[PDB]
Amino acid sequence: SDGDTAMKAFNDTFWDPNAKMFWKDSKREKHQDFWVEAELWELVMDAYQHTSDPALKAELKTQIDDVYDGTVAKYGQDWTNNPFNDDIMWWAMGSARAYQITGNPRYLEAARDHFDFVYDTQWDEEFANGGIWWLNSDHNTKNACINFPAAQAALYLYDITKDEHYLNAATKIFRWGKTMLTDGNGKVFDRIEIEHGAVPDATHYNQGTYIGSAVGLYKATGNAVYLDDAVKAAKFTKNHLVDSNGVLNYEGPNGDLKGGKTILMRNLAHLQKTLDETGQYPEFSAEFDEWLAFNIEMAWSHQNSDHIVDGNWAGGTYESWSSAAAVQALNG
Numbered sequence: 249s250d251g252d253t254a255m256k257a258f259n260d261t262f263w264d265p266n267a268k269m270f271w272k273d274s275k276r277e278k279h280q281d282f283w284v285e286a287e288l289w290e291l292v293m294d295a296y297q298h299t300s301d302p303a304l305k306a307e308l309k310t311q312i313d314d315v316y317d318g319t320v321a322k323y324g325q326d327w328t329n330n331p332f333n334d335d336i337m338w339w340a341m342g343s344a345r346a347y348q349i350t351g352n353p354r355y356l357e358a359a360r361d362h363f364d365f366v367y368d369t370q371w372d373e374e375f376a377n378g379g380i381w382w383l384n385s386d387h388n389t390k391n392a393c394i395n396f397p398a399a400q401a402a403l404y405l406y407d408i409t410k411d412e413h414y415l416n417a418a419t420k421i422f423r424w425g426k427t428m429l430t431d432g433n434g435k436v437f438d439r440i441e442i443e444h445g446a447v448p449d450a451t452h453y454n455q456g457t458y459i460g461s462a463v464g465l466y467k468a469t470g471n472a473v474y475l476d477d478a479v480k481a482a483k484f485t486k487n488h489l490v491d492s493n494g495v496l497n498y499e500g501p502n503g504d505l506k507g508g509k510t511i512l513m514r515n516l517a518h519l520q521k522t523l524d525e526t527g528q529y530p531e532f533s534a535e536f537d538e539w540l541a542f543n544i545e546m547a548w549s550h551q552n553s554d555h556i557v558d559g560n561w562a563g564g565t566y567e568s569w570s571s572a573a574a575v576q577a578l579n580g
């Protein structure tokens with residue numbers, strides 16, 4: 249049970265049962281950033297779905313509710329006072345998943361109300377012919393880190409509700425994003441800035457949410473073009489966001505990007521499952537599976553004696569966001 253071992257060690261090192269939040273690092277001086285906390289929430293959910301130890305499973309199910317409670321105690325229930333639309337949407341997506349797992353109606357209202365605020369008021373047709381703004385304060389840029397997560401959140405809400413409103417939203421957001429925030433061959437651009445144009449800088453987490461939304465659209469629509477879209481973005485990641493031995497890059501020193509492999513790995517697992525089930529792209533599937541396994545083994549060979557792995561997978565304080573990626577990789 250390497251996935252169980254990895255998750256237990258992550259909790260032992262970083263979980264604060266008193267505040268019901270993760271610590272930012274092993275000094276236990278400061279709790280994790282708001283948007284990153286939603287991604288650690290999803291890690292708890294993924295370990296819950298992966299494990300077959302019923303005692304650990306029940307423990308992780310309780311933790312799903314505690315993570316939300318601790319964040320609500322510090323930040324409130326209404327997140328629309330946060331000027332970052334991406335922060336809001338990461339929590340809306342997490343809330344949709346928490347509803348799928350628990351059935352607790354507070355999570356459905358949280359997902360729906362926050363999705364609606366962003367989509368209904370922060371979509372604009374004028375600048376760049378579409379897209380959602382990064383912030384709800386100033387309107388200067390439209391970014392991959394809000395647009396693709398918004399498509400993914402719409403797809404979860406469609407699965408829950410069967411309301412075509414959400415499928416129509418996902419289709420519209422993704423079409424815009426593919427056209428304005430990619431090169432058409434799987435390279436995902438960070439953002440488009442008013443008075444400048446596209447900033448074509450690719451990162452692990454934006455490759456990830458593009459891939460996850462494309463796989464979700466394939467499943468919901470039956471259009472094979474969406475699967476092709478996801479494969480091209482996975483090939484780009486494997487060939488161009490890696491070191492000379494094929495190990496995924498380290499994206500520091502930026503604090504938001506350092507743990508981005510967590511989001512990438514979560515979404516690559518969705519593509520791997522869809523390829524295994526459909527038997528499509530058999531040649532790429534075999535190469536992709538082998539490359540993933542090589543990455544996981546190299547990462548875990550760098551673990552310390554407490555079973556924690558730093559985010560520099562190619563080589564004394566450990567950080568929760570950087571260290572999460574190796575745990576996610578064993579819970580997919």
Ligand SMILES: OC[C@H]1O[C@H](SC[C@H]2CNC[C@@H](O)[C@@H]2O)[C@@H](O)[C@@H](O)[C@@H]1O
Binds near residue numbers: 332391393438
């Ligand atoms: O270059 C990393 C990253 O930086 C921001 S998103 C990160 C912010 C999310 N909201 C809370 C902030 O504290 C955080 O910096 C955006 O410029 C994004 O497009 C880019 O990829």
